[PDB]
Enzyme design. Sequence first.
Site, short mmCIF file in Angstrom:
data_model
loop_
_atom_site.label_atom_id
_atom_site.label_comp_id
_atom_site.label_asym_id
_atom_site.label_seq_id
_atom_site.Cartn_x
_atom_site.Cartn_y
_atom_site.Cartn_z
N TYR A 66 -24.74 -61.31 -3.08
CA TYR A 66 -26.07 -61.31 -3.68
C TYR A 66 -26.72 -59.94 -3.47
O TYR A 66 -26.80 -59.45 -2.35
CB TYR A 66 -26.93 -62.40 -3.05
CG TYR A 66 -28.35 -62.38 -3.54
CD1 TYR A 66 -29.38 -61.92 -2.73
CD2 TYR A 66 -28.66 -62.82 -4.82
CE1 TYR A 66 -30.69 -61.91 -3.19
CE2 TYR A 66 -29.96 -62.80 -5.29
CZ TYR A 66 -30.97 -62.34 -4.46
OH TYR A 66 -32.26 -62.33 -4.93
N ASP A 74 -18.93 -52.29 -20.15
CA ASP A 74 -20.28 -52.73 -20.51
C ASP A 74 -21.31 -52.07 -19.60
O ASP A 74 -22.15 -52.73 -18.98
CB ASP A 74 -20.38 -54.26 -20.47
CG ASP A 74 -21.54 -54.79 -21.33
OD1 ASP A 74 -22.08 -54.03 -22.16
OD2 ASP A 74 -21.89 -55.97 -21.18
C1 LIG Z 1 -29.96 -60.50 -8.78
N1 LIG Z 1 -28.83 -60.29 -7.89
C2 LIG Z 1 -27.56 -60.62 -8.24
C3 LIG Z 1 -27.32 -61.16 -9.49
C4 LIG Z 1 -26.02 -61.48 -9.84
C5 LIG Z 1 -24.97 -61.26 -8.93
C6 LIG Z 1 -25.33 -60.71 -7.69
N2 LIG Z 1 -26.59 -60.41 -7.34
C7 LIG Z 1 -23.63 -61.57 -9.34
C8 LIG Z 1 -23.37 -62.13 -10.54
C9 LIG Z 1 -21.99 -62.45 -10.99
C10 LIG Z 1 -21.43 -61.69 -12.01
C11 LIG Z 1 -20.20 -62.01 -12.55
C12 LIG Z 1 -19.47 -63.10 -12.07
C13 LIG Z 1 -18.11 -63.39 -12.61
N3 LIG Z 1 -18.07 -63.78 -13.89
C14 LIG Z 1 -16.86 -63.99 -14.42
C15 LIG Z 1 -15.68 -63.83 -13.71
C16 LIG Z 1 -15.74 -63.43 -12.39
C17 LIG Z 1 -16.98 -63.22 -11.83
F1 LIG Z 1 -17.05 -62.87 -10.53
C18 LIG Z 1 -20.02 -63.86 -11.05
C19 LIG Z 1 -21.26 -63.54 -10.52
CL1 LIG Z 1 -21.89 -64.55 -9.25
C20 LIG Z 1 -24.46 -62.46 -11.43
O1 LIG Z 1 -24.31 -63.06 -12.49
N4 LIG Z 1 -25.73 -62.06 -11.07
C21 LIG Z 1 -26.78 -62.27 -12.06
C22 LIG Z 1 -26.58 -61.36 -13.26
O2 LIG Z 1 -26.85 -60.02 -12.88
C23 LIG Z 1 -26.47 -59.11 -13.92
C24 LIG Z 1 -27.11 -59.47 -15.25
N5 LIG Z 1 -26.45 -58.75 -16.34
C25 LIG Z 1 -27.03 -60.97 -15.52
O3 LIG Z 1 -27.35 -61.74 -14.35
#
Ligand SMILES: CNc1cc2c(cn1)cc(-c1ccc(-c3ncccc3F)cc1Cl)c(=O)n2C[C@H]1OC[C@H](N)CO1
Length: 265
Positions: free
Chosen positions: A88, A131
């Site tokens: 996070y 991206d």
């Molecule tokens: C706010 N702090 C935060 C947000 C996070 C993550 C970590 N800290 C980690 C992520 C995150 C990404 C990809 C994956 C993932 N997807 C597919 C395959 C493998 C994977 F590991 C998993 C996670 Cl948990 C995340 O969505 N946000 C939110 C996101 O942020 C950026 C935006 N553009 C959209 O919202």
Amino acid sequence: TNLKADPEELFTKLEKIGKGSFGEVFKGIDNRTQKVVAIKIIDLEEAEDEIEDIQQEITVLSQCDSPYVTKYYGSYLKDTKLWIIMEYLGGGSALDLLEPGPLDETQIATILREILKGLDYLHSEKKIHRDIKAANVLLSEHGEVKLADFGVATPFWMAPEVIKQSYDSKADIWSLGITAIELARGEPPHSELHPMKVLFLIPKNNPPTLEGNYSKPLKEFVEACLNKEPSFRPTAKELLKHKFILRNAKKTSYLTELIDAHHHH
Ligand SMILES: CNc1cc2c(cn1)cc(-c1ccc(-c3ncccc3F)cc1Cl)c(=O)n2C[C@H]1OC[C@H](N)CO1
């Protein structure tokens, strides 16, 4: 992917951050360490056509070990739902941090420098982010800057040769140039236009330039990235020595002021 452990015993799910790609993302707690994690939950029956893209992003992230790429902790399958665990980053995205008002050029240069450190890492590993944009750049609560949301192997940040389906790591350098404009102006070029028009304008038009009362080194940084000819774009390694970066970037810890500004807004 762990098909035996129960992610609902290992993690406490908290508030939704938002809807990322493929599924919803939540802030959560690792119940063994109490560290905060990001948890993406993907419904595999709902998202069946995208399963291979999910797998390939997992593979790429599991191969990254860099301060500049968001850490990947693992995945779990519970019934039909795939839980993906990442670190996070509590500062939010660079796009979020534009909300209170414009960045100054020290903040722009510091964020671009850290993005470049991540691109240098990826390109040295023969990887392409695909991206780069302000929404996919995440900050820790300490001001550290990391890349997230790799693109799959919306058009505004795409290099012309990616659109013409003709590419290599220099596509990331173009996207970085668009991101530099985004950090300075708040939005990428053509942001008012329909995406299908942007799809033909990017190959057709001269490259965008940064317009406004910005320093000439910043305008030159943008111009260097935004050359239609990929071989004329510099490498990330070279851009880390660009005069805009050297003269303006400062310690990342200073970005906590930007994170605090977003909290008070
Ligand atoms: C706010 N702090 C935060 C947000 C996070 C993550 C970590 N800290 C980690 C992520 C995150 C990404 C990809 C994956 C993932 N997807 C597919 C395959 C493998 C994977 F590991 C998993 C996670 Cl948990 C995340 O969505 N946000 C939110 C996101 O942020 C950026 C935006 N553009 C959209 O919202």
